[PDB]
Amino acid sequence: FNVAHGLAWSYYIGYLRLILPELQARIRTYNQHYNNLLRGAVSQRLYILLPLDCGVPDNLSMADPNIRFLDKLPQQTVYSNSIYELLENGQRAGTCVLEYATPLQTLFAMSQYSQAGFSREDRLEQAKLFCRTLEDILADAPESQNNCRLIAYQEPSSFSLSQEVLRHLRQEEKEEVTV
Amino acid sequence: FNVAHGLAWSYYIGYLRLILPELQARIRTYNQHYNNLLRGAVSQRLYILLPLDCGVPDNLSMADPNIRFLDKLPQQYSNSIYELLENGQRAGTCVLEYATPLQTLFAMSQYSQAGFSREDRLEQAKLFCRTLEDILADAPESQNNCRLIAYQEPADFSLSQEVLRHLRQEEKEEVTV
Ligand SMILES: CCn1nc(C)cc1C(=O)Nc1nc2cc(C(N)=O)ccc2n1CCCCn1c(NC(=O)c2cc(C)nn2CC)nc2cc(C(N)=O)ccc21
Ligand SMILES: [Ca+2]
Ligand SMILES: [Ca+2]
């Protein structure tokens, strides 16, 4: 009995499969303004944060204060999407469309619902499974694996999410320019 | 690999568990107006349509012409009240809506990479029903706030009549027990 299968498939079929196609161009559009104005460009990929503690806060800033909301992204000329700037020592070091995964929140709710019989150990196993399954789905999906990137991580002590995101953005740019 | 397990748990945790508590009261209120005008009442339960074919239309009246939209419901998420008709006469009224996760099972069966056949879609649809049933069977006051209407449509069927069967059964239960 694995709720993570359905959660992954439903996140893809109901949300990613629909929103991603518009994206790769919507960001291309925005970067006209962004490049001309702030002398920086937004990464093309949609970054999906997958905290394995299934802890999705209301806003990204609360979890890490170096992730800072920048600007809402427009639609192609019913979905809101937020550009966040990543920070280092107060300086802008990257920008990206970055959002938490709703399925993970369901797993947290389940672990606080006693009639589920769903322990924290169960919750973590199912979070990992959600990650692996969504990976498999995007692997066989067209231009979608290319339009979005998954960032799974386990908090220990103190941890830096802005840094883990910047790792990925810098890797993405490395790829863009090399190949 | 049963997607229906996750789909059921997500439908309950992320949606039903949220709107049902409000709903009991919201309809309790609305009926103050309905009783005064037209001598009609709206059932307290939320009726969830589970077509086994997973065919969800964009407007219920297209699925059965005897199911006319009546009125949207106010808040304490959009829910719609429908009148069920017989020979043009109003025979019932209820908050009515489709289980949207079935849409997902439909999309999957039209998505070739998934290997999700129509046989699969039907198995997972039935399973979605059984799983959500169980969930509401352990849930507090929630089983009481809504009713599941799972039906399989025939090669050789009235939805408004299926629903009306349930509503009349509900009223029977109300006045006897
Ligand atoms: C967990 C909920 N549920 N589970 C399943 C399975 C089906 C549903 C379900 O019934 N849902 C839903 N019924 C609604 C009816 C009304 C009403 N009455 O009007 C208003 C809102 C309603 N909702 C919530 C909106 C869902 C769409 N949605 C998502 N969904 C996901 O992430 C997600 C997680 C899993 C698993 N599967 N999915 C895809 C369906 N993310 C969004 C982000 C934005 C944005 N960026 O603004 C906008 C919409 C978004
Ligand atoms: Ca190059
Ligand atoms: Ca049908």
mmCIF file of C-alpha atoms and ligand atoms in Angstrom:
data_model
loop_
_atom_site.group_PDB
_atom_site.id
_atom_site.type_symbol
_atom_site.label_atom_id
_atom_site.label_comp_id
_atom_site.label_asym_id
_atom_site.label_seq_id
_atom_site.Cartn_x
_atom_site.Cartn_y
_atom_site.Cartn_z
ATOM 1 C CA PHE A 1 0.000 0.000 0.000
ATOM 2 C CA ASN A 2 1.850 3.051 -1.354
ATOM 3 C CA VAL A 3 0.042 6.398 -1.465
ATOM 4 C CA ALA A 4 3.128 7.944 -3.060
ATOM 5 C CA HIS A 5 2.441 6.309 -6.443
ATOM 6 C CA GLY A 6 -0.883 8.087 -6.858
ATOM 7 C CA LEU A 7 0.449 11.339 -5.428
ATOM 8 C CA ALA A 8 3.291 11.442 -7.958
ATOM 9 C CA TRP A 9 1.148 10.458 -10.937
ATOM 10 C CA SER A 10 -1.467 13.016 -9.896
ATOM 11 C CA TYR A 11 1.061 15.808 -9.402
ATOM 12 C CA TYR A 12 2.328 15.144 -12.923
ATOM 13 C CA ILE A 13 -0.943 14.510 -14.760
ATOM 14 C CA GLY A 14 -2.913 17.199 -12.959
ATOM 15 C CA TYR A 15 -0.330 19.953 -12.563
ATOM 16 C CA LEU A 16 3.128 19.549 -14.125
ATOM 17 C CA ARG A 17 1.990 18.153 -17.486
ATOM 18 C CA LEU A 18 -0.285 21.198 -17.813
ATOM 19 C CA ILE A 19 1.850 24.050 -16.440
ATOM 20 C CA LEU A 20 5.313 23.152 -17.785
ATOM 21 C CA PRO A 21 4.685 23.528 -21.564
ATOM 22 C CA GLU A 22 3.812 27.215 -21.104
ATOM 23 C CA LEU A 23 6.819 27.723 -18.838
ATOM 24 C CA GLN A 24 9.869 27.376 -21.088
ATOM 25 C CA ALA A 25 8.554 30.325 -23.102
ATOM 26 C CA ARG A 26 6.991 32.341 -20.261
ATOM 27 C CA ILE A 27 10.448 32.612 -18.684
ATOM 28 C CA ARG A 28 12.020 33.365 -22.076
ATOM 29 C CA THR A 29 9.590 36.294 -22.263
ATOM 30 C CA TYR A 30 10.273 37.558 -18.743
ATOM 31 C CA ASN A 31 14.045 37.554 -19.312
ATOM 32 C CA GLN A 32 13.632 40.392 -21.814
ATOM 33 C CA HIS A 33 12.560 42.710 -19.000
ATOM 34 C CA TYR A 34 14.794 40.955 -16.462
ATOM 35 C CA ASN A 35 17.965 41.075 -18.566
ATOM 36 C CA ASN A 36 17.370 44.670 -19.665
ATOM 37 C CA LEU A 37 16.601 45.782 -16.107
ATOM 38 C CA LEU A 38 18.499 43.857 -13.408
ATOM 39 C CA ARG A 39 21.393 42.652 -15.630
ATOM 40 C CA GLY A 40 20.495 39.056 -14.807
ATOM 41 C CA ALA A 41 18.401 36.258 -16.255
ATOM 42 C CA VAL A 42 15.997 33.733 -14.734
ATOM 43 C CA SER A 43 16.808 30.056 -15.182
ATOM 44 C CA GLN A 44 14.594 28.310 -17.728
ATOM 45 C CA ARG A 45 13.781 25.352 -15.479
ATOM 46 C CA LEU A 46 11.053 25.031 -12.875
ATOM 47 C CA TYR A 47 12.690 24.073 -9.583
ATOM 48 C CA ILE A 48 10.582 21.801 -7.374
ATOM 49 C CA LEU A 49 11.737 21.585 -3.766
ATOM 50 C CA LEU A 50 11.083 18.181 -2.159
ATOM 51 C CA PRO A 51 11.806 18.450 1.573
ATOM 52 C CA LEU A 52 11.813 14.887 2.864
ATOM 53 C CA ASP A 53 10.543 16.169 6.226
ATOM 54 C CA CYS A 54 7.402 17.049 4.197
ATOM 55 C CA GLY A 55 7.540 20.463 5.870
ATOM 56 C CA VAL A 56 6.105 23.001 3.430
ATOM 57 C CA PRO A 57 5.927 26.515 4.957
ATOM 58 C CA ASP A 58 3.530 29.213 3.822
ATOM 59 C CA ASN A 59 6.394 31.198 2.264
ATOM 60 C CA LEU A 60 9.848 30.217 1.045
ATOM 61 C CA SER A 61 11.552 33.017 2.997
ATOM 62 C CA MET A 62 10.592 31.636 6.414
ATOM 63 C CA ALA A 63 12.489 28.386 5.803
ATOM 64 C CA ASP A 64 15.615 30.169 4.519
ATOM 65 C CA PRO A 65 15.993 33.978 4.596
ATOM 66 C CA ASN A 66 18.413 33.988 1.639
ATOM 67 C CA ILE A 67 15.577 32.787 -0.606
ATOM 68 C CA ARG A 68 13.635 36.006 -1.186
ATOM 69 C CA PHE A 69 10.498 36.562 -3.250
ATOM 70 C CA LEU A 70 11.251 38.688 -6.301
ATOM 71 C CA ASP A 71 8.358 38.832 -8.765
ATOM 72 C CA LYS A 72 5.314 36.880 -9.870
ATOM 73 C CA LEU A 73 5.542 35.247 -13.298
ATOM 74 C CA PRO A 74 2.830 36.069 -15.892
ATOM 75 C CA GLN A 75 0.816 33.691 -18.076
ATOM 76 C CA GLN A 76 1.105 32.974 -21.792
ATOM 77 C CA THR A 77 -0.027 35.875 -23.981
ATOM 78 C CA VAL A 78 -5.024 30.049 -14.059
ATOM 79 C CA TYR A 79 -1.740 29.484 -12.179
ATOM 80 C CA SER A 80 0.435 31.748 -10.031
ATOM 81 C CA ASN A 81 4.191 31.156 -10.043
ATOM 82 C CA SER A 82 6.837 33.019 -8.077
ATOM 83 C CA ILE A 83 10.388 33.991 -9.007
ATOM 84 C CA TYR A 84 12.716 33.939 -5.995
ATOM 85 C CA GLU A 85 16.213 35.421 -5.751
ATOM 86 C CA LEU A 86 18.860 33.404 -3.904
ATOM 87 C CA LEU A 87 21.281 35.374 -1.738
ATOM 88 C CA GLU A 88 24.865 35.191 -0.498
ATOM 89 C CA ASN A 89 26.171 37.847 1.912
ATOM 90 C CA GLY A 90 23.306 40.091 0.827
ATOM 91 C CA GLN A 91 24.173 39.891 -2.888
ATOM 92 C CA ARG A 92 21.899 38.370 -5.527
ATOM 93 C CA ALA A 93 23.480 35.103 -6.685
ATOM 94 C CA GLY A 94 20.680 33.522 -8.725
ATOM 95 C CA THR A 95 17.035 33.715 -9.671
ATOM 96 C CA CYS A 96 14.548 30.993 -10.445
ATOM 97 C CA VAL A 97 10.938 29.891 -10.440
ATOM 98 C CA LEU A 98 10.906 27.683 -7.350
ATOM 99 C CA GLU A 99 7.982 26.008 -5.590
ATOM 100 C CA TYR A 100 7.236 23.353 -2.987
ATOM 101 C CA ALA A 101 5.391 20.141 -3.847
ATOM 102 C CA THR A 102 1.765 19.828 -2.717
ATOM 103 C CA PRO A 103 1.813 15.989 -2.487
ATOM 104 C CA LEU A 104 4.398 16.206 0.291
ATOM 105 C CA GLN A 105 1.984 18.312 2.323
ATOM 106 C CA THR A 106 -0.604 15.560 2.014
ATOM 107 C CA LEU A 107 1.922 13.118 3.501
ATOM 108 C CA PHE A 108 2.448 15.437 6.480
ATOM 109 C CA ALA A 109 -1.305 15.802 7.060
ATOM 110 C CA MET A 110 -1.651 12.016 6.924
ATOM 111 C CA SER A 111 1.041 11.644 9.573
ATOM 112 C CA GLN A 112 -0.989 13.951 11.853
ATOM 113 C CA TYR A 113 -4.218 11.983 11.167
ATOM 114 C CA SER A 114 -4.484 9.106 13.632
ATOM 115 C CA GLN A 115 -7.051 6.989 11.773
ATOM 116 C CA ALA A 116 -4.450 6.668 8.999
ATOM 117 C CA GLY A 117 -1.985 4.591 11.015
ATOM 118 C CA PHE A 118 0.698 6.575 9.190
ATOM 119 C CA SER A 119 3.896 7.057 11.197
ATOM 120 C CA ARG A 120 6.737 9.503 10.602
ATOM 121 C CA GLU A 121 8.784 6.525 9.399
ATOM 122 C CA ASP A 122 5.995 5.735 6.947
ATOM 123 C CA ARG A 123 5.920 9.412 5.967
ATOM 124 C CA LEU A 124 9.629 9.513 5.123
ATOM 125 C CA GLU A 125 9.519 6.240 3.191
ATOM 126 C CA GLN A 126 6.622 7.645 1.145
ATOM 127 C CA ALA A 127 8.364 10.989 0.588
ATOM 128 C CA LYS A 128 11.388 9.175 -0.833
ATOM 129 C CA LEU A 129 9.071 7.038 -2.958
ATOM 130 C CA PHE A 130 7.282 10.146 -4.245
ATOM 131 C CA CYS A 131 10.665 11.529 -5.324
ATOM 132 C CA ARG A 132 11.827 8.363 -7.101
ATOM 133 C CA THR A 133 8.454 7.906 -8.824
ATOM 134 C CA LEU A 134 8.207 11.499 -10.059
ATOM 135 C CA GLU A 135 11.763 11.032 -11.348
ATOM 136 C CA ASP A 136 10.732 7.954 -13.342
ATOM 137 C CA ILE A 137 7.735 9.837 -14.732
ATOM 138 C CA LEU A 138 9.764 12.828 -15.918
ATOM 139 C CA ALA A 139 12.399 10.492 -17.390
ATOM 140 C CA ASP A 140 9.912 9.136 -19.939
ATOM 141 C CA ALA A 141 8.243 12.551 -20.378
ATOM 142 C CA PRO A 142 8.886 14.817 -23.380
ATOM 143 C CA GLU A 143 10.735 18.122 -22.896
ATOM 144 C CA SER A 144 9.319 18.019 -19.358
ATOM 145 C CA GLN A 145 12.374 16.553 -17.638
ATOM 146 C CA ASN A 146 14.061 19.386 -19.552
ATOM 147 C CA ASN A 147 11.704 22.117 -18.294
ATOM 148 C CA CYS A 148 11.836 21.311 -14.561
ATOM 149 C CA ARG A 149 14.277 20.059 -11.941
ATOM 150 C CA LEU A 150 13.699 18.243 -8.641
ATOM 151 C CA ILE A 151 15.594 19.205 -5.475
ATOM 152 C CA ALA A 152 15.204 16.509 -2.808
ATOM 153 C CA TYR A 153 16.971 17.020 0.502
ATOM 154 C CA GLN A 154 16.962 15.958 4.152
ATOM 155 C CA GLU A 155 17.639 18.465 6.905
ATOM 156 C CA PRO A 156 20.007 17.080 9.597
ATOM 157 C CA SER A 157 21.908 21.058 13.026
ATOM 158 C CA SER A 158 21.610 23.932 10.535
ATOM 159 C CA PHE A 159 21.207 23.673 6.769
ATOM 160 C CA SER A 160 21.195 26.031 3.768
ATOM 161 C CA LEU A 161 18.456 25.660 1.175
ATOM 162 C CA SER A 162 19.477 28.726 -0.834
ATOM 163 C CA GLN A 163 22.899 27.088 -1.197
ATOM 164 C CA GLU A 164 21.469 23.736 -2.286
ATOM 165 C CA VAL A 165 19.377 25.575 -4.886
ATOM 166 C CA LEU A 166 22.332 27.650 -6.087
ATOM 167 C CA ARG A 167 24.358 24.467 -6.494
ATOM 168 C CA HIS A 168 21.698 23.333 -8.972
ATOM 169 C CA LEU A 169 21.400 26.668 -10.794
ATOM 170 C CA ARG A 170 25.168 26.897 -11.285
ATOM 171 C CA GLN A 171 25.237 23.315 -12.515
ATOM 172 C CA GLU A 172 22.422 24.142 -14.946
ATOM 173 C CA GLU A 173 24.345 27.114 -16.353
ATOM 174 C CA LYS A 174 27.490 24.988 -16.662
ATOM 175 C CA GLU A 175 25.438 22.569 -18.775
ATOM 176 C CA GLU A 176 23.830 25.289 -20.897
ATOM 177 C CA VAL A 177 27.206 26.730 -21.899
ATOM 178 C CA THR A 178 29.218 23.538 -22.337
ATOM 179 C CA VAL A 179 26.886 21.361 -24.409
ATOM 180 C CA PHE B 1 1.441 0.047 -8.366
ATOM 181 C CA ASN B 2 -2.051 1.244 -7.367
ATOM 182 C CA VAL B 3 -2.447 4.964 -8.056
ATOM 183 C CA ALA B 4 -5.961 4.790 -6.588
ATOM 184 C CA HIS B 5 -4.655 4.511 -3.014
ATOM 185 C CA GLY B 6 -2.813 7.817 -3.245
ATOM 186 C CA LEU B 7 -5.595 9.473 -5.226
ATOM 187 C CA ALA B 8 -8.171 8.566 -2.572
ATOM 188 C CA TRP B 9 -6.029 9.664 0.369
ATOM 189 C CA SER B 10 -5.199 12.922 -1.379
ATOM 190 C CA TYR B 11 -8.817 13.642 -2.290
ATOM 191 C CA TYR B 12 -9.835 13.185 1.343
ATOM 192 C CA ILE B 13 -6.866 14.835 3.064
ATOM 193 C CA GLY B 14 -6.483 17.790 0.715
ATOM 194 C CA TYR B 15 -10.128 18.441 -0.122
ATOM 195 C CA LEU B 16 -13.009 16.583 1.561
ATOM 196 C CA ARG B 17 -11.596 16.847 5.086
ATOM 197 C CA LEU B 18 -11.549 20.619 4.499
ATOM 198 C CA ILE B 19 -14.901 21.508 2.890
ATOM 199 C CA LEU B 20 -17.225 19.005 4.625
ATOM 200 C CA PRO B 21 -17.131 20.529 8.164
ATOM 201 C CA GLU B 22 -18.130 23.907 6.730
ATOM 202 C CA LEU B 23 -20.682 22.329 4.407
ATOM 203 C CA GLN B 24 -23.028 20.860 7.013
ATOM 204 C CA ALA B 25 -23.588 24.369 8.396
ATOM 205 C CA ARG B 26 -23.544 26.183 5.047
ATOM 206 C CA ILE B 27 -26.498 24.130 3.811
ATOM 207 C CA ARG B 28 -28.232 24.319 7.195
ATOM 208 C CA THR B 29 -28.158 28.103 6.655
ATOM 209 C CA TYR B 30 -29.113 28.247 2.947
ATOM 210 C CA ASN B 31 -32.202 26.183 3.653
ATOM 211 C CA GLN B 32 -33.585 29.087 5.706
ATOM 212 C CA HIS B 33 -34.081 30.877 2.385
ATOM 213 C CA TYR B 34 -35.155 27.783 0.454
ATOM 214 C CA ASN B 35 -37.897 26.849 2.948
ATOM 215 C CA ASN B 36 -39.319 30.369 2.735
ATOM 216 C CA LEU B 37 -39.450 30.379 -1.085
ATOM 217 C CA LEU B 38 -40.581 27.510 -3.342
ATOM 218 C CA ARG B 39 -41.332 25.224 -0.350
ATOM 219 C CA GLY B 40 -38.132 23.337 -1.121
ATOM 220 C CA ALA B 41 -35.193 22.033 0.884
ATOM 221 C CA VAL B 42 -31.612 21.106 -0.035
ATOM 222 C CA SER B 43 -30.160 17.852 1.267
ATOM 223 C CA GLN B 44 -27.523 18.210 3.976
ATOM 224 C CA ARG B 45 -25.114 15.694 2.440
ATOM 225 C CA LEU B 46 -22.518 16.346 -0.233
ATOM 226 C CA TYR B 47 -23.106 13.920 -3.099
ATOM 227 C CA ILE B 48 -19.964 12.759 -4.897
ATOM 228 C CA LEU B 49 -20.471 11.264 -8.351
ATOM 229 C CA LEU B 50 -18.045 8.418 -9.155
ATOM 230 C CA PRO B 51 -18.582 7.367 -12.774
ATOM 231 C CA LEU B 52 -16.624 4.143 -13.215
ATOM 232 C CA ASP B 53 -15.728 5.146 -16.787
ATOM 233 C CA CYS B 54 -14.081 8.248 -15.243
ATOM 234 C CA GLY B 55 -15.964 10.437 -17.709
ATOM 235 C CA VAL B 56 -16.170 13.850 -16.036
ATOM 236 C CA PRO B 57 -17.884 16.603 -18.060
ATOM 237 C CA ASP B 58 -17.340 20.325 -17.611
ATOM 238 C CA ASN B 59 -21.039 20.924 -16.828
ATOM 239 C CA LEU B 60 -23.355 18.422 -15.151
ATOM 240 C CA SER B 61 -26.353 19.333 -17.312
ATOM 241 C CA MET B 62 -24.449 17.928 -20.301
ATOM 242 C CA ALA B 63 -24.239 14.564 -18.492
ATOM 243 C CA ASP B 64 -28.006 14.427 -17.905
ATOM 244 C CA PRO B 65 -30.538 17.080 -18.972
ATOM 245 C CA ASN B 66 -32.738 16.355 -15.925
ATOM 246 C CA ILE B 67 -29.877 17.685 -13.777
ATOM 247 C CA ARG B 68 -30.168 21.469 -13.975
ATOM 248 C CA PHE B 69 -27.876 23.864 -12.163
ATOM 249 C CA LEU B 70 -29.879 25.803 -9.599
ATOM 250 C CA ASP B 71 -27.636 27.995 -7.463
ATOM 251 C CA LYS B 72 -24.122 28.285 -6.118
ATOM 252 C CA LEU B 73 -23.541 27.795 -2.389
ATOM 253 C CA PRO B 74 -22.210 30.577 -0.117
ATOM 254 C CA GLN B 75 -19.392 30.255 2.404
ATOM 255 C CA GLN B 76 -19.209 30.366 6.201
ATOM 256 C CA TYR B 77 -14.037 26.600 -3.052
ATOM 257 C CA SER B 78 -17.189 26.733 -5.193
ATOM 258 C CA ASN B 79 -19.984 24.203 -4.687
ATOM 259 C CA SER B 80 -23.108 24.076 -6.828
ATOM 260 C CA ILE B 81 -26.677 23.105 -5.952
ATOM 261 C CA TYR B 82 -28.565 21.120 -8.577
ATOM 262 C CA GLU B 83 -32.237 20.452 -9.135
ATOM 263 C CA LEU B 84 -33.091 16.903 -10.191
ATOM 264 C CA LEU B 85 -36.064 16.758 -12.546
ATOM 265 C CA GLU B 86 -38.809 14.296 -13.421
ATOM 266 C CA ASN B 87 -41.198 15.078 -16.281
ATOM 267 C CA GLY B 88 -40.068 18.680 -15.906
ATOM 268 C CA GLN B 89 -41.145 18.676 -12.248
ATOM 269 C CA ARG B 90 -38.504 19.441 -9.632
ATOM 270 C CA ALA B 91 -37.944 16.170 -7.779
ATOM 271 C CA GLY B 92 -34.830 16.934 -5.761
ATOM 272 C CA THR B 93 -32.113 19.359 -4.793
ATOM 273 C CA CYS B 94 -28.590 18.723 -3.566
ATOM 274 C CA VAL B 95 -24.987 19.837 -3.496
ATOM 275 C CA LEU B 96 -23.530 17.625 -6.197
ATOM 276 C CA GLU B 97 -20.097 17.249 -7.761
ATOM 277 C CA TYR B 98 -17.773 14.773 -9.462
ATOM 278 C CA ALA B 99 -14.769 13.160 -7.814
ATOM 279 C CA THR B 100 -12.105 15.006 -9.818
ATOM 280 C CA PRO B 101 -9.337 12.387 -9.265
ATOM 281 C CA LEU B 102 -11.158 10.212 -11.795
ATOM 282 C CA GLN B 103 -10.142 12.793 -14.390
ATOM 283 C CA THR B 104 -6.581 11.804 -13.508
ATOM 284 C CA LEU B 105 -7.201 8.106 -14.118
ATOM 285 C CA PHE B 106 -8.726 9.122 -17.449
ATOM 286 C CA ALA B 107 -5.748 11.276 -18.412
ATOM 287 C CA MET B 108 -3.378 8.434 -17.522
ATOM 288 C CA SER B 109 -5.242 6.048 -19.812
ATOM 289 C CA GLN B 110 -4.762 8.548 -22.663
ATOM 290 C CA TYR B 111 -1.043 8.935 -21.788
ATOM 291 C CA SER B 112 0.897 6.293 -23.701
ATOM 292 C CA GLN B 113 4.120 6.370 -21.668
ATOM 293 C CA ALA B 114 2.118 5.179 -18.654
ATOM 294 C CA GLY B 115 0.996 1.814 -20.030
ATOM 295 C CA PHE B 116 -2.338 2.437 -18.290
ATOM 296 C CA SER B 117 -5.054 0.551 -20.166
ATOM 297 C CA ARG B 118 -8.817 1.006 -19.971
ATOM 298 C CA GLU B 119 -8.926 -2.269 -18.044
ATOM 299 C CA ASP B 120 -6.477 -0.673 -15.624
ATOM 300 C CA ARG B 121 -8.465 2.572 -15.467
ATOM 301 C CA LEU B 122 -11.601 0.663 -14.461
ATOM 302 C CA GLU B 123 -9.805 -1.474 -11.867
ATOM 303 C CA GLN B 124 -8.277 1.656 -10.318
ATOM 304 C CA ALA B 125 -11.628 3.458 -10.463
ATOM 305 C CA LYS B 126 -13.391 0.715 -8.503
ATOM 306 C CA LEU B 127 -10.440 0.664 -6.099
ATOM 307 C CA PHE B 128 -10.634 4.443 -5.659
ATOM 308 C CA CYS B 129 -14.252 3.955 -4.591
ATOM 309 C CA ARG B 130 -13.528 1.165 -2.100
ATOM 310 C CA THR B 131 -10.605 3.095 -0.592
ATOM 311 C CA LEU B 132 -12.512 6.353 -0.162
ATOM 312 C CA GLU B 133 -15.403 4.390 1.360
ATOM 313 C CA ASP B 134 -13.043 2.963 3.989
ATOM 314 C CA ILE B 135 -11.508 6.376 4.681
ATOM 315 C CA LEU B 136 -14.921 7.912 5.366
ATOM 316 C CA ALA B 137 -15.806 4.840 7.449
ATOM 317 C CA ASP B 138 -13.075 5.733 9.946
ATOM 318 C CA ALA B 139 -13.614 9.518 9.602
ATOM 319 C CA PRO B 140 -15.276 11.785 12.215
ATOM 320 C CA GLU B 141 -18.661 13.188 11.157
ATOM 321 C CA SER B 142 -17.370 13.157 7.572
ATOM 322 C CA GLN B 143 -19.075 9.923 6.518
ATOM 323 C CA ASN B 144 -22.223 11.706 7.707
ATOM 324 C CA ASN B 145 -21.544 14.824 5.601
ATOM 325 C CA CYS B 146 -21.406 13.155 2.169
ATOM 326 C CA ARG B 147 -22.530 10.182 0.079
ATOM 327 C CA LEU B 148 -20.688 8.311 -2.669
ATOM 328 C CA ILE B 149 -22.546 7.487 -5.888
ATOM 329 C CA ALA B 150 -20.514 4.976 -7.896
ATOM 330 C CA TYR B 151 -22.162 3.695 -11.078
ATOM 331 C CA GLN B 152 -21.184 1.801 -14.230
ATOM 332 C CA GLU B 153 -22.901 2.838 -17.401
ATOM 333 C CA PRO B 154 -24.271 0.271 -19.810
ATOM 334 C CA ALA B 155 -23.594 -0.597 -23.423
ATOM 335 C CA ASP B 156 -27.373 -0.870 -23.860
ATOM 336 C CA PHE B 157 -29.347 4.763 -17.663
ATOM 337 C CA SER B 158 -30.572 7.883 -15.841
ATOM 338 C CA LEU B 159 -28.122 9.694 -13.586
ATOM 339 C CA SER B 160 -30.765 12.072 -12.223
ATOM 340 C CA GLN B 161 -32.669 8.940 -11.166
ATOM 341 C CA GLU B 162 -29.633 7.337 -9.520
ATOM 342 C CA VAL B 163 -29.165 10.531 -7.510
ATOM 343 C CA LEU B 164 -32.884 10.732 -6.751
ATOM 344 C CA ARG B 165 -32.823 7.178 -5.412
ATOM 345 C CA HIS B 166 -30.084 8.240 -3.005
ATOM 346 C CA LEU B 167 -31.826 11.461 -1.928
ATOM 347 C CA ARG B 168 -35.113 9.675 -1.219
ATOM 348 C CA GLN B 169 -33.270 6.969 0.689
ATOM 349 C CA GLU B 170 -31.563 9.719 2.689
ATOM 350 C CA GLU B 171 -34.869 11.410 3.549
ATOM 351 C CA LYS B 172 -36.385 8.066 4.555
ATOM 352 C CA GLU B 173 -33.443 7.556 6.921
ATOM 353 C CA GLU B 174 -33.823 11.091 8.276
ATOM 354 C CA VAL B 175 -37.462 10.802 9.311
ATOM 355 C CA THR B 176 -37.369 7.191 10.551
ATOM 356 C CA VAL B 177 -34.129 7.217 12.557
HETATM 357 C C1 LIG C 1 -5.239 17.461 -2.919
HETATM 358 C C2 LIG C 1 -6.507 17.811 -3.649
HETATM 359 N N1 LIG C 1 -6.848 16.839 -4.685
HETATM 360 N N2 LIG C 1 -6.070 15.722 -4.810
HETATM 361 C C3 LIG C 1 -6.614 15.035 -5.810
HETATM 362 C C4 LIG C 1 -6.020 13.732 -6.239
HETATM 363 C C5 LIG C 1 -7.732 15.700 -6.335
HETATM 364 C C6 LIG C 1 -7.855 16.853 -5.602
HETATM 365 C C7 LIG C 1 -8.856 17.954 -5.666
HETATM 366 O O1 LIG C 1 -10.062 17.718 -5.674
HETATM 367 N N3 LIG C 1 -8.350 19.229 -5.703
HETATM 368 C C8 LIG C 1 -9.173 20.336 -5.725
HETATM 369 N N4 LIG C 1 -10.469 20.290 -5.958
HETATM 370 C C9 LIG C 1 -10.894 21.620 -5.856
HETATM 371 C C10 LIG C 1 -12.166 22.169 -6.012
HETATM 372 C C11 LIG C 1 -12.325 23.548 -5.857
HETATM 373 C C12 LIG C 1 -13.687 24.157 -6.020
HETATM 374 N N5 LIG C 1 -14.697 23.601 -5.361
HETATM 375 O O2 LIG C 1 -13.828 25.147 -6.750
HETATM 376 C C13 LIG C 1 -11.229 24.353 -5.546
HETATM 377 C C14 LIG C 1 -9.966 23.813 -5.388
HETATM 378 C C15 LIG C 1 -9.820 22.441 -5.547
HETATM 379 N N6 LIG C 1 -8.717 21.603 -5.457
HETATM 380 C C16 LIG C 1 -7.344 22.018 -5.151
HETATM 381 C C17 LIG C 1 -6.595 22.529 -6.371
HETATM 382 C C18 LIG C 1 -5.722 21.469 -7.023
HETATM 383 C C19 LIG C 1 -5.011 21.962 -8.274
HETATM 384 N N7 LIG C 1 -3.673 22.497 -7.998
HETATM 385 C C20 LIG C 1 -2.583 21.804 -7.537
HETATM 386 N N8 LIG C 1 -2.613 20.447 -7.294
HETATM 387 C C21 LIG C 1 -1.520 19.725 -6.899
HETATM 388 O O3 LIG C 1 -0.414 20.232 -6.701
HETATM 389 C C22 LIG C 1 -1.739 18.263 -6.725
HETATM 390 C C23 LIG C 1 -1.357 17.395 -5.734
HETATM 391 C C24 LIG C 1 -1.822 16.135 -6.123
HETATM 392 C C25 LIG C 1 -1.688 14.830 -5.409
HETATM 393 N N9 LIG C 1 -2.455 16.195 -7.291
HETATM 394 N N10 LIG C 1 -2.389 17.511 -7.656
HETATM 395 C C26 LIG C 1 -3.003 17.905 -8.923
HETATM 396 C C27 LIG C 1 -4.506 17.830 -8.888
HETATM 397 N N11 LIG C 1 -1.506 22.584 -7.398
HETATM 398 C C28 LIG C 1 -1.939 23.855 -7.779
HETATM 399 C C29 LIG C 1 -1.243 25.062 -7.826
HETATM 400 C C30 LIG C 1 -1.916 26.210 -8.249
HETATM 401 C C31 LIG C 1 -1.181 27.518 -8.307
HETATM 402 N N12 LIG C 1 0.084 27.501 -8.709
HETATM 403 O O4 LIG C 1 -1.767 28.562 -7.986
HETATM 404 C C32 LIG C 1 -3.259 26.145 -8.620
HETATM 405 C C33 LIG C 1 -3.956 24.952 -8.578
HETATM 406 C C34 LIG C 1 -3.278 23.819 -8.154
HETATM 407 CA CA CA C 2 28.784 25.725 -25.641
HETATM 408 CA CA CA C 3 -20.483 8.487 -18.506
#
